[model samples]
Target: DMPERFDAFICYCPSDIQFVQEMIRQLEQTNYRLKLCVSDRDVLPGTCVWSIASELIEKRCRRMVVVVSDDYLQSKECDFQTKFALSLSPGAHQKRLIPIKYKAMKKEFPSILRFITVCDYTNPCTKSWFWTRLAKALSLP
Candidate 1:
């Protein structure tokens, strides 16, 4: 199999698509190679594309950017992707999953996802912090 090329993949609820896309654009401004499978871009209605997309995501992605909101945990697909990524051991070549809290939702971070720290991009300062931490996480030596 061909090794994955993207540096990060954005996993988010359909409702959070706008925020996720904006973040992708920001990441791109920094020349970060990112893959965002939003509702309109990769997900097709009335088909099995969700499963196919998620599977491909698991296979090729190196990192995850989960848009955490109350609606996110309620979505089965989001739950699946977060759980699948978290199940992977840190050294297993599975992607590193990081939850990006965009809203102040009363939700608990999944235990599996809790190991990795989260990025709260609720404001400009935190958004900058998020990018700085994200770059550090990549550590592309």
Candidate 2:
């Protein structure tokens, strides 16, 4: 039998694992019926990251959530994942990718990612707003 498709696939650099863990925890506690795919936890050891990512994003996930930070932008693997996700469901209007700005940075984002509105998680005061926005984006009840 085939594995179930995921509600969302989370793409982030290893450095941001703490934040990603918190996000996953919150989602699990909420009313949203979200089944997430995260590389470190979901992908089996010894499997190629690219193969797993490709299969998950291309066939098993409804959407992707990219945690954008300086570390994420600098990683070639992350860039490849971002481009792959965009290729699967091209255009900012489609909402196939959701970007979460994890930290403030001066570097300009790629042209393809600039047009999509990002959920800013840099501010402590906006945590509630961020969750609300994310939940709505994921169509959580």
Candidate 3:
């Protein structure tokens, strides 16, 4: 009765679909065998996207991966997703939300997420451990 339907709720910008694809291949398909509630597929149509997304983030998924990019700031839904995820785990005691900086931000970062340390996919130095660490973080409660 306590089983979560999905391992992680993935949030990303439309412009960064390619990066998300890579994440799927690495984290979901080939490597980790994790389940991700990707937006383009898992989100049901015919309702407010944020409401569905908020439900997915809060109830269905055990963790959330927010793919961060400068492009990400443009989406109103992503903002709500990010804000809502944080609200579910204020001060991040739960580690319910994991922010992945997939690209170097040209604009300022989301200041609210600054308190939580983010995984930098753009850096070669830590790239080797990124996927495994994230997979472990989202492994299980």
Candidate 4:
């Protein structure tokens, strides 16, 4: 099989793995080649998945789905993932980074990322609108 080029989604939060997996399952059902870039299984003892995951997100991801939560913003690895991806983008070609509000938490999102549209998973319509908009943005076939 072809190496799934568009198989490029960076799953960012350790705490929300279950929900992320469900989201992946749903996305795969559509014609999207989504990759789960982070998981406990992907993280071995004494190993840093951050750098490796960061590289993948910056180079391979067509669009990044940031699983936003209080814990995610607090996480050093998650912070690195988003920051690094943004840094890779210059003027107009910056990758499409979508912040999915996986939980209702009061955490200060980075000011740079505040402009990206968010999908409030807490609300059904918001979630639907996000996926629809994202698919359109990505030009999914």
* lDDT of the candidates, in the order given: 0.60, 0.67, 0.67, 0.56
* Model 1 lDDT per residue over 1-141, tens place: 223444555677787766765666556555444333432445433321112255666566566667888888888757677567756777543247767887787878776666666777776677455665665565352
Off by over 4 Å in 4: 1-4, 33-36, 39-53, 90-95, 127-136, 139-141
Error at 116, model 3, angstroms: 0.3
- Please, what is the TM-score per model? 0.70, 0.77, 0.78, 0.69
- Residue-wise C-alpha lDDT for candidate 4, range 1-141, written one tens digit per residue: 322344345546677666666665555455544433443434433322222334555556566667777878777757676566557546422356666776678877766667656667788666454554555555542
TM-score of 2: 0.77
Pairs of residues clashing in candidate 4: none
lDDT for 71 in candidate 3 is: 81
Cα-based lDDT at residue 97, candidate 1: 70
Quote the lDDT for 140 in model 2. Answer: 38
Which lDDT tens digits does candidate 3 get at residues 1-141?
A: 223577877777778777876776566433566666655553333321222245555777777788888788778756776567557636653377778887668776576666777888888898676777778778867
| Span of ten consecutive residues with least summed lDDT in model 1 | 43-52
Report the lDDT of model 3 for residue 57: 57
From the highest TM-score down, the ranking of the candidates is 3, 2, 1, 4
lDDT of 2 by residue, 1-141 (tens): 233677677888877777777777666666765667765564333321222355556577777788887888888657776667557545633467777887778777666668877777887877675665676677632
Model 3 C-alpha lDDT versus the unseen true structure: 0.67
RMSD (Cα, Å) of candidate 4? 5.3
